[PDB]
C-alpha cells in the first residue's frame, strides 16, 4: 500500500540551466538519465512537496543502483543534472495524478 510504482515513460522535457556549459553537458548526457519516475501513491495523501521529493530521491537512487550494475558511475554534476530533470518529471507525474483524480 505504501510502496513505490513507476509512472509512464516520458519524452525528454526541455530543461534549462544557468549556463551554456551546463546546457551543453546536459544535452550530451541526458541519454544517461531516467525517463520514467518512481512515485508513492500514498504520498497523494500528503503534500505536493513530499510526493515530489520522495519521487526525486527514489528515482535517482534506483537509477544509480541500475547504472552501477552496468559498471558506470554518476558524478556530482550528473546528480545535480538529474535532480533538475527528475524534479520536473515528478511534478509532471503529480499533475497527471491530480488531473486523473479530479477528472
Topology:
Blueprint: E1 5-6, H1 20-29, E2 38-39, H2 48-68, H3 76-102
Antiparallel strand pairs: 1-2
Helix pairs in contact: 2-3
Your description of this structure?
This is Major prion protein. Glycans are attached at residues 57, 73. Belongs to the prion family. 20% of the residues are buried. Helix 2 (48-68) packs across helix 3 (76-102). 56% of the residues lie in helices and 4% in strands. It has a two-stranded antiparallel sheet with strand order 1-2. The protein has a single domain, classed as Major Prion Protein (Orthogonal Bundle), CATH 1.10.790.10. It is mostly helical. The chain contains 3 helices and 2 strands; from the N terminus they run E-H-E-H-H.
Relevant terms:
103 residues, two-stranded antiparallel sheet, mainly alpha, Major Prion Protein, 3 helices, globular
The CATH superfamily is known as Prion/Doppel protein, beta-ribbon domain
Number of helices: 3
Question: Can you write the helix and strand succession as a string?
Answer: EHEHH
Strand coverage percent: under 5%
PDB class: membrane protein
Keywords: Prion protein, Cell membrane, Disulfide bond, GPI-anchor, Membrane, Prion
Assembly: monomeric
Entry title: Human prion protein variant V129
